[PDB]
């Protein structure tokens, strides 16, 4: 369930268009899994990064 986007996600801030890609999700998942906390607790690290 700690999956990745098959294609980039347009986040589309109110002023500047923004894009999430597979690599930033990769890094965020790496940090969350490094923390080792349960899923709903490592959610904090994932969202923060």
């Amino acid at each position: 369930r700690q999956e990745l986007p098959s294609e980039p996600i347009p986040i589309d801030l109110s002023d500047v268009t923004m894009r999430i890609d597979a690599e930033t999700a990769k890094w965020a998942r790496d940090e969350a899994r490094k923390t080792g906390l349960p899923h709903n607790e490592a959610r904090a690290e994932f969202v923060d990064v």
Binding site: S14, D15, E23, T24, W27, E31, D48, V49
Partner: protein
């Protein structure tokens, strides 16, 4: 790039706490949006104008 440290976490924590709702003086992005819509002039068009 993809490097995370306590300073990065602290910086995010500060930004998260330093602004819970938008302020009147810090919401300049609406103005900055309208500047980007006009391109820069060079010498020739400047003198003609």
């Amino acid at each position: 790039d993809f490097v995370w440290d306590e300073e990065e976490s602290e910086a995010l924590r500060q930004a998260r706490k330093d602004a819970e709702l938008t302020a009147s003086a810090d919401s300049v992005r609406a103005y900055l949006k309208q500047i980007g819509k006009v391109a820069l002039l060079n010498a020739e068009e400047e003198v003609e104008l």
